[PDB]
Specification:
By secondary structure, the chain is an alpha+beta fold. Helix content is 18%, strand content 21%. It has helices spanning 24-28, 47-53, 71-81, 158-167, 172-182, 210-221, 251-260, 278-282, 298-301, 353-356, and strands at residues 5-7, 35-41, 63-67, 87-91, 105-110, 114-119, 134-137, 192-196, 199-202, 233-236, 271-274, 311-313, 329-334, 340-347, 358-360, 365-368, 372-377, 387-389, 399-400, 409-410. The strands form three sheets. Strands 8, 10, 11, 12, 13, 14, 17, 18, 19 and 20 form a ten-stranded mixed sheet that branches. α4 (158-167) packs antiparallel against α5 (172-182) and α6 packs parallel to α7 (251-260). Bound molecules: 5-hydroxypyrazine-2,3-dicarboxylic acid (K7A). 5-hydroxypyrazine-2,3-dicarboxylic acid binds at residues 43, 100, 122, 238-239, 293, 295, 327, 350. The PDB classes it as hydrolase. The entry lists the keywords fragment based drug design, DNA binding protein, Hydrolase.
């Protein structure tokens, strides 16, 4: 397969549904490279657990943890890392309120080259245990010979775009990694980088980040097709922010308009949102505790009940993961019969203005609160017009492995979106428990 798109291993499914999945121990194995140093970009960290996932012979190699924690949270993280002399920390600046460092990325420097891993999991045991999570694995990037002058750039501009994402941190520990990336050849990269960094962007810079970055890529590198209005948009996520009093405020105005973009020319397009119902969570491998990682609050949800009529159940028979609650986030543009897709995005970004950006100042400025990161699969980048959808995720290699079932299934009348801070005591979960916050 050319896509190098993986799910994490799930404890409790039959072996055929973990054949070709990746645990973090697999990613860090000596089989992937002889580790020299690594950078772990993430949101939440269990440092004791994390070091144990490295092979014993690599556990004293330098590790950089890139996080966004402040005040007591920051002190807690520093206390976690203090027993390991080889661990340094980089506090990503979050100068806009309510933003987080949400990017999930590994930079893996080997003796043999460099690897980039962009994924969706926190660095804690539960995120790699029984959740549905996504991974993109870069090729092994070789080092450019000293004295050789070449770009090492890909047709997707991935090398420059990754350096640009890192330069936004303005951080000395990350300038070191930028110099490492400069010294490697990334030209085989066939995915486009889509990042979010905190800021207020106008003019040219508007297209650099968030949903405007997505729009620009789709404008420039996808083509429109007859009856494009009939190709739905699908968004699939594990948290929802405050989107406004009705769908015109953000979801169907600027967000959907970016996601609908195809080609360069100038809406009844169906919008399917996939987010676990209470029943999905109750019957899950984890039971109600899976809802600890689905942080939709009642205070947000009660102000936007209009949104829930967009919601579809989590279903993943194709990958044996209907009971492994989603922590992956994905966005895509399937054909009206869901047999093809025009593009697929895997990312850390949930369905929030903080992650994707919201227009300000009479539509001239895109404001983003958070760090986010994903990779975009475009048919043009593989010499194709569209991707066919792989029928069984783990079963002509140029079909894209969509990890959940199509078409998505609308909530039933008695279904409700998972809301983590109200009790569920009508029926017990797979471990025999109720949910009482
Ligand atoms: O996983 C979590 O618990 C989580 N919590 C809050 C947030 O904004 N995002 C996430 C995520 O990683 O999806």
């Amino acid at each position: 397969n050319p896509f190098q798109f993986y799910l994490t291993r799930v404890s409790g499914v039959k072996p055929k549904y973990n054949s070709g999945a990746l645990h973090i121990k697999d990613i860090l194995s000596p089989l992937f490279g002889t580790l020299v140093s690594s950078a772990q970009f993430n949101y939440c960290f269990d440092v004791d657990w994390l070091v144990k996932q490295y092979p014993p012979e690599f556990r004293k190699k330098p590790i950089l943890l890139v996080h966004g924690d402040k005040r007591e949270a920051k002190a807690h993280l520093h206390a976690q890392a203090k027993p390991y002399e080889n661990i340094s920390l980089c506090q990503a600046k979050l100068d806009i309120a309510f933003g987080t460092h949400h990017t999930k990325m590994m930079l893996l420097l080997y003796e043999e080259g460099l690897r980039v891993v962009i994924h969706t999991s926190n660095l804690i045991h539960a995120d790699w245990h029984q959740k549905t999570q996504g991974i993109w694995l870069s090729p092994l990037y070789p080092r450019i010979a000293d004295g050789t002058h070449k770009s090492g750039e890909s047709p997707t501009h991935f090398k420059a775009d990754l350096i640009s994402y890192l330069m936004a941190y303005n951080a000395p520990s990350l300038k070191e990694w930028i110099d490492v990336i400069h010294k490697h050849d990334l030209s085989e990269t066939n995915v486009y980088l889509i990042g979010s960094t905190p800021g207020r962007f106008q003019g040219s810079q508007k297209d650099n980040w968030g949903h405007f970055r997505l729009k620009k890529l789709l404008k420039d590198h996808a083509s429109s097709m007859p009856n494009a209005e009939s190709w739905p948009v699908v968004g699939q996520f594990s948290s929802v922010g405050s989107l406004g009093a009705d769908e015109s405020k953000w979801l169907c105005s600027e967000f959907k308009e970016s996601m609908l973009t195809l080609g360069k020319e100038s809406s009844s397009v169906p919008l399917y949102l996939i987010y676990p119902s209470v029943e999905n969570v109750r019957t899950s491998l984890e039971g109600y505790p899976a809802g600890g990682s689905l942080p939709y609050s009642i205070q947000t949800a009660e102000k936007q009940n209009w949104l829930h009529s967009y919601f579809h159940k989590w279903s993943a028979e194709t990958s044996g993961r209907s009971n492994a609650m989603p922590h992956i986030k994905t966005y895509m543009r399937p054909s009206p019969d869901f047999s093809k897709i025009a593009w697929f995005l895997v990312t850390s970004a949930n369905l929030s203005k903080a992650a994707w950006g919201a227009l300000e100042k009479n539509g001239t400025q895109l404001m983003i609160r958070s760090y986010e990161l994903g990779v975009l699969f475009l048919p043009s980048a593989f010499g194709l017009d569209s991707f066919k959808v792989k029928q069984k995720f783990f079963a002509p290699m140029a079909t894209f492995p969509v990890p959940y079932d199509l078409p998505p299934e609308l909530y039933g009348s008695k279904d409700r979106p998972w809301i983590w801070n109200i009790p569920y005591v009508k029926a017990p979960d797979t471990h025999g428990n109720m949910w009482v916050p």
